[PDB]
Amino acid sequence: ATLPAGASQVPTTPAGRPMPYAIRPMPEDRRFGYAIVGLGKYALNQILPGFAGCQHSRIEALVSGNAEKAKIVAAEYGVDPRKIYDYSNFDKIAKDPKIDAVYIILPNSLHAEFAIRAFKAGKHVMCEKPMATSVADCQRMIDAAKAANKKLMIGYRCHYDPMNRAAVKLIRENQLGKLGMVTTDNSDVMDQNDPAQQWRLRRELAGGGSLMDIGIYGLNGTRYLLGEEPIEVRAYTYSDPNDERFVEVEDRIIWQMRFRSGALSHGASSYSTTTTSRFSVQGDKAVLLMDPATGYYQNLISVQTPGHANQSMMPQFIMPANNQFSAQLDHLAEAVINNKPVRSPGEEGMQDVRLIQAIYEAARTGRPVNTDWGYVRQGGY
Amino acid sequence: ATLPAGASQVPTTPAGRPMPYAIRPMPEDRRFGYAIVGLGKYALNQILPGFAGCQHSRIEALVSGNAEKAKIVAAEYGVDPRKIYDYSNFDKIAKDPKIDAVYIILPNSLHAEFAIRAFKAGKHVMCEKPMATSVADCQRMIDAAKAANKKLMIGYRCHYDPMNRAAVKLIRENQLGKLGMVTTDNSDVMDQNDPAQQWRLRRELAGGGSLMDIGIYGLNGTRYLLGEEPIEVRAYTYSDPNDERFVEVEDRIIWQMRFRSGALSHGASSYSTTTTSRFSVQGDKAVLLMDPATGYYQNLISVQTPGHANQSMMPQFIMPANNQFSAQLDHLAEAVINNKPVRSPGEEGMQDVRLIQAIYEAARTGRPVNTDWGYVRQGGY
Amino acid sequence: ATLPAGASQVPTTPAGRPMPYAIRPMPEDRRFGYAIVGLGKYALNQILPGFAGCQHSRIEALVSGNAEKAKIVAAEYGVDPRKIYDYSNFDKIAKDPKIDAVYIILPNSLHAEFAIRAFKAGKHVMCEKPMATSVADCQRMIDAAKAANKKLMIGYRCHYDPMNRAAVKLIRENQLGKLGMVTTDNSDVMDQNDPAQQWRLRRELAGGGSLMDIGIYGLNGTRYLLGEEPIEVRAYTYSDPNDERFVEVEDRIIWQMRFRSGALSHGASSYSTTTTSRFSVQGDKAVLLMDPATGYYQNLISVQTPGHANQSMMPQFIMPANNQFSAQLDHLAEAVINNKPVRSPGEEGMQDVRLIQAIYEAARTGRPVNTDWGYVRQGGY
Amino acid sequence: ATLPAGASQVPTTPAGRPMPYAIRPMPEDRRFGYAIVGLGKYALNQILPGFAGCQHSRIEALVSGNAEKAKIVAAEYGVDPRKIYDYSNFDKIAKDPKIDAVYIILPNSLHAEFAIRAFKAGKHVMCEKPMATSVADCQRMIDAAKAANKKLMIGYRCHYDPMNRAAVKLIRENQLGKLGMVTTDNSDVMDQNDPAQQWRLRRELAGGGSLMDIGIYGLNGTRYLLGEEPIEVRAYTYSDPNDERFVEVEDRIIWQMRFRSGALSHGASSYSTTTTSRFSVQGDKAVLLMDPATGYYQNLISVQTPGHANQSMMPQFIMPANNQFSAQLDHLAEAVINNKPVRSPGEEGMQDVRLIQAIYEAARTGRPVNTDWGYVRQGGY
Ligand SMILES: NC(=O)C1=CN([C@@H]2O[C@H](COP(=O)(O)OP(=O)(O)OC[C@H]3O[C@@H](n4cnc5c(N)ncnc54)[C@H](OP(=O)(O)O)[C@@H]3O)[C@@H](O)[C@H]2O)C=CC1
Ligand SMILES: NC(=O)C1=CN([C@@H]2O[C@H](COP(=O)(O)OP(=O)(O)OC[C@H]3O[C@@H](n4cnc5c(N)ncnc54)[C@H](OP(=O)(O)O)[C@@H]3O)[C@@H](O)[C@H]2O)C=CC1
Ligand SMILES: NC(=O)C1=CN([C@@H]2O[C@H](COP(=O)(O)OP(=O)(O)OC[C@H]3O[C@@H](n4cnc5c(N)ncnc54)[C@H](OP(=O)(O)O)[C@@H]3O)[C@@H](O)[C@H]2O)C=CC1
Ligand SMILES: NC(=O)C1=CN([C@@H]2O[C@H](COP(=O)(O)OP(=O)(O)OC[C@H]3O[C@@H](n4cnc5c(N)ncnc54)[C@H](OP(=O)(O)O)[C@@H]3O)[C@@H](O)[C@H]2O)C=CC1
What we know:
30% helix; Gfo/Idh/MocA-like_OxRdtase_N (chains A, B, C, D); nine-stranded mixed β-sheet; oxidoreductase (chains A, B, C, D); six-stranded parallel β-sheet; binds NADPH dihydro-nicotinamide-adenine-dinucleotide phosphate
């Protein structure tokens, strides 16, 4: 019959009010400083814009071999033009104490190099995936991290994507029952004219074909969805011999893996078919379909049983968790601040490279490769 | 300003009217008489009920080893108690001209026998899939068919399924661009307490495990979707050794194939996980998702591109085409009446048995098996 | 390590087996004989074919004003040519004990007549909706029913529809929280060239336009979803004056209702737009979307909350419940046999006719019409 | 056989490269300066964070009556603490030539006030919806805009949301055929304890209930989807008399409108049921379903016909157009820069308020209100 206290007490006159309700991740500070190395497609389309959403990170400086671009980029994000390094004086960042970490967004073959030069610079490292083009180079990056007593983090965004985490969460709850068969697919049409794609066609720079580039999402995903490691691996690859895009690196490759629990999986990556990011986890109770499974946006998951399809996706008005990009950046910032192990350490990034090598080996020999090497996911998936 | 002639002409008193518009297949004739062999799960749940929707077929007789069950089923479908046969006096159907064909729905290893006896009895044959448990037996059936000058059709219900034909049509019309990667998955939890599943647990009666039973859908489907034959296959199978269900047949099995066009495929079948029937066909212009892919009901397909998902399924009020069960049944009928070849001939059933053989061989030896033997799909896919 | 007793016991030679597991409603008996009246669109497309799936019903006779059509239909459904009646000798069915009930599928204005003659002939009645074209006529039918001591059931197929019952069940179980707003829409393009639509264009034969024909679904559905009766209605209708289809009946009409609980609803029906059958039920905890809501096939419902869409539809392999056509038919049958009241009695059909009357009145006067007349749903919704 | 020129020419050594391909809206500058007035829920959750994505806008200063908050906010977005005004010295912004415009994000009753004081300050105006609490106050805002020769823009984000524009685009293409029936629903549970909701419960501050707050999306949407104005209106409202939340403003209200083309529509807004944002446009060719229809994120649209559902939504990896928030902000910036009329001028915002008044009037009197007042959408919908 009567308005509650608060309503009637609101002044019909201009008056300040308390802080509003938060339905979205609010900014909190920018204490952690980042130095972005490699201003390419991913860096300028996804990572740089992804800072605005961070709660504890900022872009302190840039590192590029194209002075002009690095200039324009500096302006857009207001980075001090004096904090613009190149690949030869990159080490001079050790002087600046405001540059807490470095984000390596360079070709796969250059990752390690700048990670080590970074650690010797006493800075923390955030390296893109795949880690490096060799298991040995991954180990070195890890060795250089422990020496400088710094943290090494691999850019596994899917480890910071709400829907992916929701997927892991529901699976741990045993919503699918006993796990028995995982299926994954990751694809996109390779455009040789794309500046970012040219280095990907060189085995020396990329380290391999579609598997190293996107099939790793299937590999990595199969691992955290099932929450365990493969003990065995089998694989096959094929590329049109008349396609100049696959002279050095593979187009399509298919791998089958077995897990300790007894679960199986089959997946593939492709450079010659359109966008595909689909993961399927089959249990004896229900089946999970993630599609889109690893998109930058619009992921969608569904738990199906005869007669039902329970879909989950980002809300339309509220935002229960920060986006993967911002969440990934702040994660390292957090890790350091609160002195804690990062969820995606150098070891994790090395596991995938080591597994990928085993897979390329299996496809070359047509024989299965034993991958039961006691790796342990510290901190869980 | 005035009603059309059709409206104003309708009398306002009880009056005869013309034949109505058909928004669904109408019954036409019951010229083709069938003798059903084996009153089991598929027969009583799907085929017998499937007869009602037929436009040229009827159930004329029954053949069962359970007189009690046969008596009950005959009464339910208006079958004359005098036309109930057992497996001993089966051959006597040769004396009844009202029996035009037989439909074998017996376990796998019993197929060839009855197909042959049926042909010796001067009848056409509809045999359930998988055709037989040996390539040789498939050929013997094809031989008996040719010696009797009768038709041999294999129960590939998906070859008469409205949504599957629609998927084949948009592919042939190049809606997906060039085809490069196909993924299939077919699973369902095997229940050893189900009378129907008991013979499936026996290698001698079944001819194999999940591949023979349901993996065949991913295989056959991959073939009719791509519109070409595999020239090579690789595979690996695994089953929990402590599970009483898989002592003789396999639970999970995965296979990879390469086609003359260069396309690749990877699929699996499972006897230990929940209901999955999902086909994916990746083209360089679009991706096709069939899910459910091979259901008895509610099939749904979708053509995806960045930003779009065009779905197709059976309408909610109209029924443009007959269901797969009824259509399959009328297909043999029409073939005989029109003196035309069947779309699912014994040769088609044999190609699958032959391929499954290659797949089992490959999983056994851990090596790729060449399947470039020149099978040619007579009449398109 | 060893197969279960059930598996090892299966003989390897042709042998009789037990009755299989049912993943779908099996035929049981054909005790209840029906006489179908009016071999038109609904009858030949939906009802006659709907008999096959029945578990207690059968077609015993036909009543048509087109001897030619009746002869053809009788042959298609095994009906004895001797049991074909016309509208003149209809009353003679009273002499046949094999005729237990009649199913009136004649245009609206002819319903009451035949329902009454059927009752005078000592038969039960299944009458299509909308019940009649006047409240009085509905009561006369109810009176004839009570005088004959027979049952009167109205063809509300959605009251026996698996997905609609599921929607009613999750609502009753408070899955949507408190109910506050319901939206309905029912449309389809009226084609004056369709023999079936010709009488629908005539006010005298139809009793009204899209509201009487299909608007009734949104109305009836709003009532069974909310589980309560409207106490007040408002409405407005409009039809293009130059369209020959709407000279006598309305094309588009919209209505609003308020219920005792306080809930509100707003829906419409259209004779000029494409296929729409969508029901929305807004609760304070969740929102339910039925779309298609009242299809002959492929119904789908979804319970939405920020970040989720839990879908439910008929399974792809199993059939937990019989279809609405067959179930409706068996419902009257079982009621007679079990000496139990029907769920869709003449009173239910009358409540709708009465409400539609109020709605037309409201649109005519532009004022709200009070409908708080105390109808009570006997047997729940 | 050989890698194309570009691939082989990429240096295996650290080397700068040209600007990458743009798959996402890139930043371009921040020439247009904004002064945000009213730091509430919407301002801090949606508008402030929405600047990072802009290509021509920045946050030059803030205006608040809560010094402390306005401080913290300044820090987070790096706004010069000297450019922090209050509601009494707000006019002092006229001094600063770097403050090109003002974004009024205050209670509905305060909109006009600050718009006029803004225009006299020689600045451009971006006012939130609904425009004001009276047609007269809207006219004054327009008069004050022409005097200062500045631009007036209403915050109709949906006029800058990709999916909404895609929806308008497909409809103009006649993909739905002749338009005949639009249905809309907009709801969310009102929380009286929410600081932002308290003023919304006061008729003096809000100007009305759910209609003024969110039902306006249905009203506005119905207009640009059909691309025309209503000539007539009818409406009804009801709220639980024992609910202290609706003593002064309405909870649920339902309106029906007719359009010149002959199209009809029914819609409603609610403060007592969960999130609902669903628009339906029915044509005689197809039907469009927008659901979510006006979300901040995850909108989804579908074009349905018997057997088809063509869905469209934001891509998962690319981003063809900037988000509604950023797009809205830059729109004004554009309008000014290129000297052009804004798509959402004060007149448009006044049309909705004028229509809403007509609707409240219709519900009060229970009679239809003629709204055929020759309004014209300059620039189209
Ligand atoms: N997490 C994920 O979602 C994704 C991660 N990535 C990873 O990010 C890294 C970069 O990928 P992407 O941005 O697509 O690639 P681009 O080719 O767009 O960027 C590579 C950048 O590296 C720098 N660079 C230095 N020397 C070399 C060299 N020898 N050849 C080529 N570039 C060089 C350049 O910076 P400059 O011109 O400024 O000097 C160049 O712009 C890869 O490791 C990739 O796997 C990429 C996409 C997605
Ligand atoms: N196209 C498709 O969708 C499907 C095809 N099928 C195929 O249908 C066939 C039968 O499968 P299903 O109906 O599930 O099996 P069931 O075991 O339920 O039925 C087989 C019937 O065969 C007869 N029979 C004769 N000798 C034997 C024997 N020694 N062991 C078991 N049965 C025997 C029995 O009939 P009676 O008691 O009358 O004598 C039995 O009921 C298989 O080849 C299977 O692959 C099955 C399901 C789906
Ligand atoms: N539950 C639901 O889903 C549906 C219910 N219905 C209802 O079924 C009833 C019939 O509809 P529908 O089948 O579409 O209509 P049709 O006009 O196609 O069939 C009506 C039948 O009534 C007989 N008839 C007798 N006198 C007349 C007369 N003067 N004018 C027209 N028909 C007459 C004819 O049968 P004959 O030629 O054999 O003598 C005619 O075929 C209606 O009450 C309708 O509301 C319809 C569709 C769906
Ligand atoms: N386009 C859209 O999507 C949306 C638009 N809006 C519109 O934005 C406007 C504000 O909505 P919203 O942010 O939800 O509301 P909040 O109550 O969260 O914000 C109102 C802000 O107005 C200022 N204010 C000044 N005096 C008053 C007063 N008398 N009472 C209340 N606040 C006052 C305060 O700023 P301070 O405390 O800093 O002094 C307050 O924080 C409304 O017109 C609303 O319709 C809102 C949501 C969605």
